[PDB]
Design a binder for these strands. Structure first.
Ligand SMILES: [Mg+2]
Ligand SMILES: [Mg+2]
Ligand SMILES: [Mg+2]
Ligand SMILES: [Mg+2]
Ligand SMILES: [Mg+2]
Ligand SMILES: [Mg+2]
Ligand SMILES: [Mg+2]
Ligand SMILES: [Mg+2]
Ligand SMILES: [Mg+2]
Ligand SMILES: [Mg+2]
Ligand SMILES: [Mg+2]
Ligand SMILES: [Mg+2]
Ligand SMILES: [Mg+2]
Ligand SMILES: [Mg+2]
Ligand SMILES: [Mg+2]
Ligand SMILES: [Mg+2]
Ligand SMILES: [Mg+2]
Ligand SMILES: [Mg+2]
Ligand SMILES: [Mg+2]
Ligand SMILES: [Mg+2]
Ligand SMILES: [Mg+2]
Ligand SMILES: [Mg+2]
Ligand SMILES: [Mg+2]
Ligand SMILES: [Mg+2]
Ligand SMILES: [Mg+2]
Ligand SMILES: [Mg+2]
Ligand SMILES: [Mg+2]
Ligand SMILES: [Mg+2]
Ligand SMILES: [Mg+2]
Ligand SMILES: [Mg+2]
Ligand SMILES: [Mg+2]
Ligand SMILES: [Mg+2]
Ligand SMILES: [Zn+2]
Lengths: 159, 187, 103, 52
RNA sequence: CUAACACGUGCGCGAGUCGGGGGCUCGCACGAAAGCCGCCGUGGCGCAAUGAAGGUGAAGGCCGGCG
RNA sequence: UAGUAGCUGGUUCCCUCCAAAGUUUCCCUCAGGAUAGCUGGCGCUCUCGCCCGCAGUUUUAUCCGGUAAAGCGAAU
RNA sequence: AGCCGGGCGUGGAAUGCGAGUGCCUAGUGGGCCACUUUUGGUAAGCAGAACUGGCGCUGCGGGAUGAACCGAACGCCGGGU
RNA sequence: GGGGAGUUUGACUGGGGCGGUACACCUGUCAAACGGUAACGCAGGUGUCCUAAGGCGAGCUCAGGGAGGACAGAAACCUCCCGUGGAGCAGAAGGGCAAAAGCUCGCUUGAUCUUGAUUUUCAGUACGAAUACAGACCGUGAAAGCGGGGCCUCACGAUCCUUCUGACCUUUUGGGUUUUAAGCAGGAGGUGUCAGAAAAGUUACCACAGGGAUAACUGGCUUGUGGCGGCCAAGCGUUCAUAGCGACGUCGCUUUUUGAUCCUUCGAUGUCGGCUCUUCCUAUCAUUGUGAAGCAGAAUUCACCAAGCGUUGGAUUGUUC
RNA sequence: GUCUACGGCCAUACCACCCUGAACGCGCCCGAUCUCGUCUGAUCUCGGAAGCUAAGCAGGGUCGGGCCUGGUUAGUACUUGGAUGGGAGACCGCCUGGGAAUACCGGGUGCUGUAGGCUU
């Protein structure tokens, strides 16, 4: 059977990208994580302290505790037929703010603003994101040039 | 052929009391009629609770009843409980209450009558208030039974304050291996 | 491994870091009147032969050796047990090694 | 074998308990006999206290 | 089938509950039943837990009197 | 002494409804058990005749990867 | 960071559907087959895995025959397709 | 003190046994781009080592190469230049690392005391290992800081018993003092079959409950091996590739050899040969009819239709051969 | 236009050679009493201001290497789902969707934050 080592099969997952080894850029250290941010997990092999287990690599969780160097986050893990929301502590290098939430936040601010506006105007405005509707009817103008014929080319071997 | 599942097709709720006595069944007849020919849902709740079993109709204590009726806004309303009103001895001052219950302890009934309240039974309750206006529907603590201390997450498992099943309490009964860091492990 | 004979470390009684004299802990002589021993001879006496098991399948060639620490402060002189990882050869404060010499 | 959850029990029926069983089917007859003896002694000691 | 335990259900009473052992009932067809005891509740279970043990043992919140 | 048997054989009426597993971990464990998983029964708390949630699905965003392919005039 | 008090309902993608929760619990813990992926093997109706569906637990029309293939899953009947 | 008694004599497992450990662990792959994922699959490693190879701080830069300098050279030491790591970091492998995680010095013992939480296998239980904290005592540095072992992934052990350490600790039972003993908490002494019995064989004198979950026949699938047959045409055949052969290749057929497997049979299908007797196949030895020869005749080759009819008597061996 | 101090993103910023640098600045540079450290004031530390853009540094150049970004390769390779499709097989075609990577050919060669200067 296999081995139950903590880092089995991570030679590519925890490795560094090509031509990106060396000193960790300081912007990663200079970011602020508060209680309740949605955050992504991406193990970085450069630092070995507080490295998350390989099964949380690429997972997104919620911050619930902030500490000197690390952050505690609640993340869902599918174990057999059930999902457990378990909390793990990850050092700040292996973490990154999720941009999936800021889009929704900006949308909230923007449609709240356009709801506050036009409230006095009384006009109607659409807020829900409708799915891509079918294309409407239109005209395709030929400019006096007729469409050119397309025919299959004859078979002839290359190799 | 239809792509459906029949596991949860049949609902398990009670249609009628499992009991066989005749007085409760007469009450059930009356409240069945009331529930189906009145739009008030108090009758529906009362009939449903009449259907229930003994362990689902826990007794309500006098202290609980006075505590829940002393709350603001609910003065001079009738306290309705489908269970048994038992006396509480650790309460001296008892006000006058208008109680309705299936059965009341003798000492509790004496206490209420001495205090000046009146005891009602669900029949006379129907006559007084068919739709049940001015009623405070109470119930005893359902989780009061001691069997619930044995339920839930199993003992000998981290962060589980569940009572084990032991034939006798003492220092020689389930205290050594799983309960101490000194002997094996501590959960 | 090599361990020095003196170590400045925490002392429980003093509640502060103090110098400690360290030695190697060796098992004491088994008292004949321990409860377990007394029960053992009471059970073994008579007929029926051997009762408790005798271990034979030895497997480990080493053992964790324990350092007995003693606070050098004459008033305190408290003692504590400290153990570290297994080792085949072990010595106390011998031939402090130096680098870059003739092999 | 243990089931899911329950109490560990130590029934003391590992001997030949079925040979030494004390049924109490003579309890009413014993009570009747003790009574009869009681009244017989009470009559025997004519004016003396029955209790003793 | 007996005993033990767990849980679910039905009934009585309910911070209590239970005579199973004994006794009183002119012993005796049924009746070896049934009724009663209450200063026969000894006692069991419950009402308090925790600690190895010595042991300890289950709210407090506002104003006037020397922020 | 009706000795024990994780092993063979047998295990008695009808209809109705629901309906599996041969997988995880531990065991002198491998023809067996315990434990999760899968099943049934008993319920209970609410709900509609504005709104709550949920989904073996899609959409819109946003991250995660080193297989198929490809490369050796790029590292090994 | 926690507290209070106050104001905002166009319920902020599509589709579908009542949901949550608690006890007690039997049987099972020999599996097999197929498209695709795949390891050992010259290979096998061989041995070993992943996903899904089946057989086992399942009858029916077709493949003459048939545990698994194709269609389709079942109360007792009449008509139609 | 096998005269006699009681008992034991692991598991896995292409039958069992011998072999091996796939039995507790770790790296890469298998593994199908989350995770997980099998086989006695593949390549390997572990039961240690370290007073520093732990912890800080400072200063330097490695492997290799080129050009120079008495002995001196291919290689001894010095200097300059190039040098993205091609070196080193204890060990297997993988990841990671350049004013460092490497090399050299300075000072030290965070490898110390203590309560909780979390991750890894997972049942989401332990052990082991690890991660963030928190509370004291410290080390180092000017300091920010860093450090409660080794850059990360592995290097280890329940109950019962014994032993040591701790408190002006509790009990030692009618009261008191002192030895003793028992407790409470933390380490150590094991169980490598590594969630942990105290354990040698033989039976052809054997027994029981079972098993076609499993071997020894046949029969099935397979056809490597055996047997037989093709295509190509290097060469042999004095000359001439193909009268007759045919190298180096390559495609098949058969189940009269052996393997491989374990589907049927273990509440039994009588398990080698020979004797006797019948029938069938053709991949034809002879005979009938043919065609080709390196066929003058004779003899003998190769091929075709073809199984109608024949295919013996003996020595040796249980033999089939 | 540009520099210095501290930086963010870390080659569009690197590497090789060549040309030009007004002012400030950054440097090279001059010495070792003190602070400090070496075999050596070479480095480090300290005290200065005779000279110089020679070098570093900055800007620019190269049908430059590299790097970054496009086109081609290419709807090719591969691939989700489907068929009582083909083929003895090996494999291949089609339907429904997604869709690469070399060679080869183009373009570009650091943006920018805070504070403080020079261009009087
Ligand atoms: Mg139907
Ligand atoms: Mg059901
Ligand atoms: Mg003796
Ligand atoms: Mg069972
Ligand atoms: Mg049970
Ligand atoms: Mg029997
Ligand atoms: Mg068995
Ligand atoms: Mg069987
Ligand atoms: Mg891979
Ligand atoms: Mg490939
Ligand atoms: Mg198979
Ligand atoms: Mg089914
Ligand atoms: Mg079917
Ligand atoms: Mg057919
Ligand atoms: Mg029809
Ligand atoms: Mg013997
Ligand atoms: Mg995958
Ligand atoms: Mg350094
Ligand atoms: Mg600390
Ligand atoms: Mg180190
Ligand atoms: Mg013999
Ligand atoms: Mg078989
Ligand atoms: Mg020739
Ligand atoms: Mg026969
Ligand atoms: Mg026979
Ligand atoms: Mg022929
Ligand atoms: Mg100088
Ligand atoms: Mg210059
Ligand atoms: Mg110049
Ligand atoms: Mg170029
Ligand atoms: Mg700037
Ligand atoms: Mg001017
Ligand atoms: Zn001390």
């Amino acid at each position: 059977t296999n081995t139950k080592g903590k880092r089995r099969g991570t030679r590519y997952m925890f490795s560094r990208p090509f031509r990106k080894h060396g000193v960790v850029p300081l912007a990663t250290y200079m970011r602020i994580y508060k209680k309740g941010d949605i955050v992504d997990i991406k193990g970085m092999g450069t630092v070995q302290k507080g490295m998350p287990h390989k099964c949380y690599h690429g997972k997104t969780g919620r911050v619930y505790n902030v500490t000197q160097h690390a952050v505690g986050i609640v993340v869902n893990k599918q174990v057999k037929g059930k999902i457990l929301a378990k909390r793990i502590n990850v050092r700040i290098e292996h973490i990154k703010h999720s941009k999936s939430r800021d889009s929704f936040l900006k949308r909230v601010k923007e449609n709240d603003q356009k709801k506050k506006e036009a409230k006095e105007k009384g006009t109607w405005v659409q807020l829900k994101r409708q799915p891509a509707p079918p294309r409407e009817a239109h005209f395709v103008r030929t400019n006096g040039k007729e469409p050119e014929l397309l025919e299959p080319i004859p078979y002839e071997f290359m190799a | 052929g239809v792509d459906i599942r029949h596991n949860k097709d049949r609902k398990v709720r009670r249609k009628e009391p499992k009991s066989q006595d005749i007085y409760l069944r007469l009450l059930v007849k009356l409240y069945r009629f009331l529930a189906r020919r009145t739009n008030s849902t108090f009758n529906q709740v009362v009939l449903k609770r009449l259907f229930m079993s003994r362990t689902n109709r826990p007794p309500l204590s006098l202290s609980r009843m006075i505590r829940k009726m002393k709350l603001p806004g609910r003065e001079n309303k009738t306290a309705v409980v489908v269970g048994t009103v038992t006396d509480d001895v650790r309460v001296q001052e008892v006000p006058k209450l208008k109680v309705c219950a299936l059965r009341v302890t003798s000492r509790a009934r004496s206490r209420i009558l001495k205090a000046g309240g009146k005891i009602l039974t669900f029949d006379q309750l129907a006559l007084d208030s068919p739709k049940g206006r001015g009623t405070v529907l109470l119930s005893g603590p359902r989780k009061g039974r001691e069997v619930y201390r044995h339920f839930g997450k199993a003992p000998g498992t981290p962060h589980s304050h569940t009572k084990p099943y032991v034939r006798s309490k003492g220092r020689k009964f389930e205290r050594a291996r799983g309960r101490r860091a000194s002997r094996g492990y501590k959960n | 491994v090599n361990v020095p004979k003196t170590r400045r470390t925490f002392c429980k009684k003093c509640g502060k870091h103090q110098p400690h004299k360290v030695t190697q802990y060796k098992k004491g002589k088994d008292s004949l009147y321990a409860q377990g021993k007394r029960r053992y001879d009471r059970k073994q006496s008579g007929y029926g032969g051997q009762t408790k098991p005798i271990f034979r399948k030895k497997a480990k060639t080493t053992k964790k050796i324990v350092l007995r620490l003693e606070c050098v402060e004459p008033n305190c002189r408290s003692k504590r047990m400290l153990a570290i990882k297994r080792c085949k050869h072990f010595e106390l404060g011998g031939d402090k090694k130096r680098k870059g010499q003739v092999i | 074998a243990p089931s899911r959850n329950g109490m560990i029990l130590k029934p003391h029926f590992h001997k030949d308990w079925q040979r030494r069983v004390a049924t109490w089917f003579n309890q009413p007859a014993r009570k009747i006999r003790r009574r009869k003896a009681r009244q017989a002694r009470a009559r025997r000691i004519a004016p003396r206290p029955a209790a003793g």
